[PDB]
Design an enzyme around this catalytic site. Sequence first.
Site, short mmCIF file in Angstrom:
data_model
loop_
_atom_site.label_atom_id
_atom_site.label_comp_id
_atom_site.label_asym_id
_atom_site.label_seq_id
_atom_site.Cartn_x
_atom_site.Cartn_y
_atom_site.Cartn_z
CE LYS A 62 -1.71 0.46 4.82
NZ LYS A 62 -2.60 1.29 5.45
CG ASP A 63 3.22 2.32 2.80
OD1 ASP A 63 2.38 3.43 2.73
OD2 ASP A 63 3.30 1.35 3.81
NE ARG A 110 -8.10 3.17 2.74
CZ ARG A 110 -8.06 2.26 3.68
NH1 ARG A 110 -9.21 1.51 3.78
NH2 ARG A 110 -7.22 2.00 4.49
NE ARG A 111 -6.98 2.61 7.92
CZ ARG A 111 -5.75 2.10 8.04
NH1 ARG A 111 -4.87 3.07 8.50
NH2 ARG A 111 -5.33 0.82 7.77
NE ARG A 128 1.64 10.30 8.98
CZ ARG A 128 1.40 9.40 7.99
NH1 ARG A 128 0.42 8.73 7.70
NH2 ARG A 128 2.65 8.95 7.23
N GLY A 129 2.45 8.00 13.02
CA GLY A 129 3.66 7.24 13.58
C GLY A 129 3.68 5.79 13.26
NE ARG A 134 -0.24 5.73 12.40
CZ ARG A 134 -1.02 6.37 11.50
NH1 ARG A 134 -2.58 6.15 11.62
NH2 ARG A 134 -0.58 6.72 10.53
CB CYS A 222 -1.08 7.26 1.20
SG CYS A 222 -0.06 5.76 1.14
#
Length: 289
Positions: A62-63, A110-111, A128-129, A134, A222
């Site tokens: 996904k990245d 998206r989420r 973030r993180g 997280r 992303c």
Amino acid sequence: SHMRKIIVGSRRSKLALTQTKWVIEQLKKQGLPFEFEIKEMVKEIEQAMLDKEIDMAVHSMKDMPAVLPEGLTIGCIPLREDHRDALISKNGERFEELPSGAVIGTSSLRRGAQLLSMRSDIEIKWIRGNIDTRLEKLKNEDYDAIILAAAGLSRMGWSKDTVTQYLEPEISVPAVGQGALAIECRENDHELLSLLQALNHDETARAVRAERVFLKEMEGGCQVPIAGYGRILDGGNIELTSLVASPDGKTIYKEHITGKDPIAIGSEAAERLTSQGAKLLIDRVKEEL
Ligand SMILES: *Cc1[nH]c(Cc2[nH]cc(CCC(=O)O)c2CC(=O)O)c(CCC(=O)O)c1CC(=O)O
């Protein structure tokens, strides 16, 4: 004995090293004469691989960029992990059970869009993180829940103590390539490609190929509220679910398409969503970033 040593570039997070080590361990199961060594270090890793400083890298699909540097290739796509988004609630509530005004942590449009389409009385808050970071922020800051990929929690063995609800794609269509790994190597490293073949899972690879074709043609990534999830049906066709949402969740474009060829279905998915207004939406979102 004296055998080829394969140098595997990796980020230093707990997850990245875990993913990288998983791959190495499966490769070792073929019992072929290769040594593996990790070199703790997507684009900088790609440069090293081009320069032959490393031979391969294990990335979260996904990245991955839409286009690989000329000379590099995704050499293997192993059996997919869990593709689903997961809700981790501090006080153990399922999504529909979270109190009115609950604060859900995610930096993904998206989420957050998909959640807001179901419930307008929740709040989406940037977070973030790395996934451990997280989880510590959920504990230590003003979030009632967070969203994480089920796959990363699985890889770490953390799911049992964290996951409140695994979100079905009906509720939250996953990021393109979520749960999949991209094992990247040089296109001319034929010995390595041959080693990687036994690890490749053709049904994962075909599905992900469809997802990526769609994402590429929509110019997503992303930072944009775009989703796509392909699975292989029992009959053997691929079914691709494609989605674009306004960040506030009020406009959803969502379609399903079934076919044999990942390129044809990814392209047709992008054509259909673009014809409905999804690409204009993504363009406008990018304008306000
Ligand atoms: C595209 C994108 N990357 C990230 C951060 C990220 N990348 C990989 C993972 C682990 C899961 C996997 O390998 O599939 C993660 C973190 C995670 O989702 O657990 C994001 C997350 C943005 C966020 O929610 O803040 C994204 C965007 C997206 O998923 O939509």
